[PDB]
Amino acid sequence: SHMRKIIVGSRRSKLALTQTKWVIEQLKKQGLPFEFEIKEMVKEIEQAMLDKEIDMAVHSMKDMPAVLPEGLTIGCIPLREDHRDALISKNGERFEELPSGAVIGTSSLRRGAQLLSMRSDIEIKWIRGNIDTRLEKLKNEDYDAIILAAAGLSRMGWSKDTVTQYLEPEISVPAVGQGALAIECRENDHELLSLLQALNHDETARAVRAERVFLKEMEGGCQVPIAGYGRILDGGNIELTSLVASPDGKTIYKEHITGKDPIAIGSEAAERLTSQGAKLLIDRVKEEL
Ligand SMILES: *Cc1[nH]c(Cc2[nH]cc(CCC(=O)O)c2CC(=O)O)c(CCC(=O)O)c1CC(=O)O
């Protein structure tokens, strides 16, 4: 029959389309009368959505801006994937087993700093590209290992043949929003928001909300050595782990806070880390970029 067609904007990478299709598939499980169509195409997708050329987009939470364009909203945050960083070693060694002088590929200051805090006898080397591209570079270039989000390898069904060690947050505190998806739509698209509700996972959303509040107040992002990971405790409170590190790994600010309200705990986390010198550190790093 004649039903509303929801147009879903997506990047063209294997991962992006996979994430986008996952979302569509879960939405279809409600059995409501909507058609979905992907339009292969964060900010340019946002412009299209504002212009009503698309109705929604599925982004990796960790790549979302602190502030959405007025008129847009994160309409849904589904049940989180694995939040953990993953080590993929060419010759199958766990982190502490990598040879002295091992070359670990990442363009993330957050990842490289944490690794360097544990081991000063490894080398962090810049690497870029989509996750497949990066796996090909690990094979074909001078890297002994790489770090990737466990979530992307999971989504692709690649983990089994790649992951050498899943890194616990004790070892590597994840990027804010890692493993979470931001399903972005217009704030006034009430029909769509209503459809997205059954997909929203309140415990994921609350945790991520705390992480983001902290990141916003610290003025962090992908380019800065800042981390935050919130989980829901069995008791129902959120526990937020917050971290800022010097790029060489020698100075770590790291704190835990537990509470009910994501805004209050994210804010208090930023206040505490800022009071310890973490914001000055981030400001100085940005000065040398
Ligand atoms: C903020 C940031 N983005 C990226 C590149 C990126 N974005 C999403 C993913 C997939 C995992 C997910 O959806 O959560 C990826 C790639 C990946 O991490 O697998 C980075 C990576 C920089 C790098 O390591 O070179 C970052 C920064 C960060 O994670 O600290």
Author numbering: -1 to 39, 61 to 308
Quote the study's own text.
The enzyme porphobilinogen deaminase (PBGD; hydroxymethylbilane synthase; EC 2.5.1.61) catalyses an early step of the tetrapyrrole-biosynthesis pathway in which four molecules of the monopyrrole porphobilinogen are condensed to form a linear tetrapyrrole. The enzyme possesses a dipyrromethane cofactor, which is covalently linked by a thioether bridge to an invariant cysteine residue (Cys241 in the Bacillus megaterium enzyme). The cofactor is extended during the reaction by the sequential addition of the four substrate molecules, which are released as a linear tetrapyrrole product. All enzymes in this family adopt a three-domain fold in which domains 1 and 2 resemble the fold of type II periplasmic binding proteins and the third domain, to which the cofactor is covalently attached, adopts a distinct α+β topology.
In addition, the structure of the enzyme in which the cofactor has undergone more extensive oxidation is presented at the slightly lower resolution of 1.6 Å with similar refinement and validation statistics. The collection of data from two crystals, which were flash-cooled at periods of 40 and 50 d after purification, demonstrates that the dipyrromethane cofactor adopts two conformations corresponding to partially oxidized states. Accordingly, refinement of the occupancies of the oxidized and reduced states in the two structures reported here showed that the proportion of the oxidized dipyrromethanone form increases in a time-dependent manner from 30% in the case of the 40-day-old protein to 50% for the 50-­day-old protein. In both of the structures of B. megaterium PBGD that we report here, the C2 ring clearly adopts two positions, one of which corresponds to the fully reduced dipyrromethane that has been observed in structures of the E. coli and human enzymes when they are crystallized under reducing conditions. In the B. megaterium enzyme the electron-density map clearly shows that the oxidized conformation of the cofactor has the same oxygen substituent in the C2 ring, which is suggestive of the same dipyromethenone form. However, the other α-position of the C2 ring which partakes in the methylene bridge with the adjacent C1 pyrrole is clearly tetrahedral, in contrast to the trigonal planar configuration that is found in dipyrromethenone. The two structures reported here superimpose very closely, with an r.m.s.d. of only 0.17 Å for all Cα atoms. Interestingly, domains 2 and 3 appear to rotate towards domain 1 by approximately 0.6° in the more oxidized structure, suggesting that as the proportion of cofactor in the more extended state increases, the active site of the enzyme is able to close more. This rigid-body rotation gives rise to movements of several loops over the active site of at most 0.5 Å.
